[PDB]
Each structure stands twice: as C-alpha cells, then as structure tokens.
Amino acid sequence: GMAQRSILVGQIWHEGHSFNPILTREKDFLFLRGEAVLEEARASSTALSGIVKTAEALGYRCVPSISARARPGGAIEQKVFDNIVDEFVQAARMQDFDAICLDLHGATLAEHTLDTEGYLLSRLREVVGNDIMISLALDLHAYLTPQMVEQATIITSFRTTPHADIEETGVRAMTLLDSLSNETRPPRAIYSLIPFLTRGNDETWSGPLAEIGAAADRWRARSDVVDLSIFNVHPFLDVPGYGQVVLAYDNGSGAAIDACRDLSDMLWKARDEFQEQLMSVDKALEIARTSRQLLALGDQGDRVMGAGPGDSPEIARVALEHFPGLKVAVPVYDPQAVRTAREAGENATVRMAVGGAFTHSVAPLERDWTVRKLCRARFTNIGPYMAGTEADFGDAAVLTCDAVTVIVTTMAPNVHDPAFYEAVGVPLASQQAVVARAANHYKLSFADIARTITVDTPGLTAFKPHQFPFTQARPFYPLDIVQWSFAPLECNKV
Ligand SMILES: [Zn+2]
C-alpha cells in the first residue's frame, strides 16, 4: 500500500528466578498503555526508547501496545502474565502496523509459562500471521529458546555487562528491521547452545568476555553477517535448553555458521574462567572501619537485581557481631517487620527477628530494634543505571540496634542507587558502609561517593549452581561433566 509505514511497539521487563518463593504480583508492575507508552519511551533511555526514537527518525509511525516493568524476582503470578499477553494480542488486533519491534528482557518467567517471550511471540503470530516481521531487543541475560528463534524475524541483545548499551540495542533492533524491508525472505538464523552457566568474572570490559566480545565485533563487521548475539543466560532458571547461546544471522550463505562456531568454541574453552573470588564480608567491613571513604557493599548472595528476594540480614549480622560500633546500613525485605514497626510506632523498641523469612540459607536477625522512622521507600534513582527512574519499595521502617541500621521494606528492595538511603532518611554521610543488592549495576551509581566492594555472601543469588535443585535444566556444566561440541540448529535455510 501507499500509506506511511507503522511499527507496533511495546515492552516487558522482568527477570525471573525459579528458586525465589515470592511470586511477582500485579502490584510489582508499572503498566503504561496507549500514547503514554510512547511519551515515556521518548523521555527515557531504555531499548524501547531506542526503538521508538529510531523508528520516528526514520519516518515510520509508532503504534503502542503496552509497557510492563517489574523488578527482578520470583515468577510472575500466572493470571497477571496471562493478562499482559492478552493486552499485547488485543493491541495486535485493533491497530494497523506493517511490522513489530519490541523491547523484552528474555528471562521473564511466569508460574506456569517457562519461556514467556517464546509464548508471547506465538500468541502474536496467531493474530498477525507469519509474513509480517518481528524484531526483538533483548537483555543478554535472556533464556534464548528455539521457539524464539523460530517465531522472531531477528533478535539482538545487549553487548555490555554492566548494561550500558541498553538504548543502543533498541536502536539496532529497529535499524536491523528497517534494513530487512526489501528482502524476499527472512534472514537465516544459526542457534548454538553451549551447556554451562557462568559463575562471575562476567563483565565485558575485562575477563573472558573481552576477547569473545572482540571476536564478535570482527564477525559483525563482515558484509556477510547481518547480526549476532551472545547470551550469558541468567543462572537461576530451572528450564530446559539451558546454557550460553550464540545466535547469528546472515542471508543464507554468509558467515553465520562460522561466526557461531568460533564464538561457541571460545565460550566453551573459557567455561571455567567465569569464576571469581569475592572479598569476604569480614575483610570488607574492616576496610570500612579503617577508611574515611564510605564503603558500598554489593550483597552478591542476595541481589534483587539477580531476582533474589533481598531478605538477607547477613551483612547486618556480621557488623553487629564482629564490628560493634561500625555504622552499617542494610535494606531488608520483611513486610511483617514493617507492619510490626508501624503498630509500635516511631520511637518504640521491639524485640523482633528481621529478614531471613525467605532465604533458607541465612538466619533472621533477632534484636531489640528501635523504630527510628516510618516512611515510604519511594525515590528517584540518580543513576547512571536507570537514571531518572522512580522506584517504590513500599512502606518502610528504619530500625536500629547498636550502630547498625536496617531499613525493612514491604516490596523487594532493589537498592542499587544512593538516592534510596537519602529518601528513607539514612544519610550516606552518617554511615561507614551501606549495602547494594546488586553485584555490577550499583558500582557506577556509587563510584563518586564510595569505594564499591561486592562481597561473598550467601543466599539465593550466590554463583553456586550446586546449591540449587535444578531438575529440568540438567544436564549442564559445572554440575554435569558433558562432552560438548558445536552442533547448531539452523532456521530459514535458503
Ligand atoms: Zn541483564
């Protein structure tokens, strides 16, 4: 037809954990619909922002479906996930569009649906058919499945950890889609599963991913590679077809197989390089005790950014027991503690076990807690990571005992930014160490005001596969000693 071309756009952001017993609920989501989806995209720096800004700079009209963002955590309540998909499907019916370009995480998880993105693509194709193009921007932590490869025209992921190319990945999803406009066929896809999980040393600026990322850039610079991505799968999913994935696209007779071979072999060779020795909590708290600079401690074992619950009071425990007088603040998921605190009121002292209700691996911390402040854990992230984005971890109580402050929260405490501490009235200057529930994504946000050390704590996000009852994920390395060699799936062979 003759009319301006339009692109259907939308977003889902959620990362799951098969071993977090706390379901992600409707409350945990921010939803936008209609034009508001596009207004937010233009004012932000997500992959969706990239998709929408690029589509509009290129002359396309963008048509909204919805956007749905919830912090990482347990599987989404199935009904809520079903309602999200239905809103996508309905937008796919009601609207006029010539192609679809979406910002999805790739490791969203629902209580019954294990491959959520794959499922979403199928439901959309039920309504839109197999001719129109669908392009995805994905997080590199995606659980990338054969169904996804089969149901999408093209897929591209982040290339940095910590994730600093989020928007650019969106730009590229849309640019790739636009580039395919005159093609008489979809591009050929080569999928390769390398059956191991990473256990740290997984940043892209140094370590094994720097070499592998360099090789990847050279492959993509060839005129006979359309694109390629490397997925370091989120390592807390009990799902089949599990491991690292290399995904490459060409015109049917380019280098997608060679690229995928080279990179799969490098990842395999490097499988035991993805390990680290994090500093102990005792050593880190002793640096804090002897430093003028604030310490910001990444609680590796209980990261909400790794879809953990954030109920570990462990760092508070060690501070209390081994460093009396050391001023440490820790954010802890404990909705009951909040409610107990709210009933006692500000200024009361209550004997109470805080934290540890959800992570089997750490004990609740029981003390005479004084309730210094009741307030809402609502604030704006300074960033860089998620700069400008508003957060709300629910009703909160700031609790003290000896020199330790525990801020208990009603919703998952995705603390990766200094604004949290200021918003709940625990000023950073007042502490010698504070806790971030992230390993990599808090560092830039605290770089200017703290020494950042990620510490070797226990819990549901420790890089210890042997601690989890993986069932349908197995076999994978390190748990199983498997004899892998390159064996790709090919899709849209020409
Ligand atoms: Zn990620």
Strand order of the largest sheet: 14-15-16-17-13-18-12-19
| Spatial separation of the terminal alpha carbons | 28 Å
- Total strands: 20
Q: What is the count of DSSP helices, taking H or I runs of 4+ residues?
A: 13
Pfam families: DUF1485 (PF07364), MlrC_C (PF07171)
Domain Microcystin LR degradation protein MlrC C-terminal: 298-471
Function: Involved in peptidolytic degradation of cyclic heptapeptide hepatotoxin microcystin (MC).
Cofactor: Zn(2+)
List the SSEs and their pairings:
Layout: E1 6-13, E2 16-17, E3 29-33, H1 35-42, H2 47-57, E4 61-70, E5 73-74, H3 78-94, E6 99-104, H4 116-128, E7 133-138, H5 146-151, E8 154-157, H6 166-179, E9 188-194, H7 208-220, E10 227-231, E11 244-250, H8 256-269, H9 281-289, E12 294-299, H10 314-322, E13 328-333, H11 335-344, E14 349-354, E15 365-380, E16 390-401, E17 404-409, H12 419-423, E18 433-436, H13 443-446, E19 450-455, E20 489-491
Parallel strand pairs: 1-4, 1-6, 2-5, 6-7, 7-8, 12-18, 12-19, 13-17, 13-18
Antiparallel strand pairs: 3-4, 9-11, 9-20, 10-11, 14-15, 15-16, 16-17
Zinc ion (ZN) binds at residues 139-141, 163.
